[PDB]
Amino acid sequence: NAVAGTIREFSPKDIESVYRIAQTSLTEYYTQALILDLHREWPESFMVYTVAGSVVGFIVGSKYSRTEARILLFAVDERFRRMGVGSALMDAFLSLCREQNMLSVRLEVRTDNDEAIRFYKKYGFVITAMLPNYYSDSSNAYTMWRIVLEHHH
């Protein structure tokens, strides 16, 4: 309870913060209005990790299919990386999927991006395809995937 910094849900009021983290963490470009737009489609999934009322990371998703969710933007501020924030947000994203009966979740990541590729592999994600000339700068992308449902013995 005493942990400093909790997960809340994005507000149009946080845009400059998120727009700043995305500029400085993602090679693909995202205008503020586009991010504000990605909100509208699945707002409840746009969540931020807040630390002394400063957004230090955010995730945001769409419903690709009635039951498959997709992760559109995921980023955490350099100065807070490895804090374990993005694990908060993924934990939270998955919980929300569990809640709205989304049975699996996909995403697309750059191929070169080893740092994240692991992060997701830590969370159970796996590679299913490679998307040729996917990004605007003509590099490729791995599509990663996992079921939501978990069991331990």
What values do phi and psi take at 29, rounded to 5?
Answer: -95, 140
Cβ-based nearer residue to ligand ACO, 4 or 153: 4
Cβ-based nearer residue to ligand ACO, 3 or 153: 3
Site string for ligand ACO, 97-136 (x = CB under 6 A): ----------x-x---x-xx-xx--x--------------
3-state helix, strand, coil in the chain (%, to 5): 35, 30, 35
CA–CA distance, 65 with 42 (Å, rounded to integer): 12
128: number of Cβ within 10 Å: 11
Chain centroid to Cα 108, Å, comes to 10
CB of 122 to ligand ACO, least distance (A): 4
Q: Quick check: 71 binds ligand ACO (CB under 6 A)?
A: yes
Per CB under 6 A, the list member of 20, 39, 81, 106 interacting with ligand ACO is: 81
CA–CA distance, 42 with 30 (Å, rounded to integer): 17
User: Where in 4-33 is the site for ligand ACO (CB under 6 A)?
Assistant: 25-26
Q: Which residues bind ligand ACO (CB under 6 A)?
A: 25-26, 71, 73-76, 80-87, 107, 109, 113, 115-116, 118-119, 122
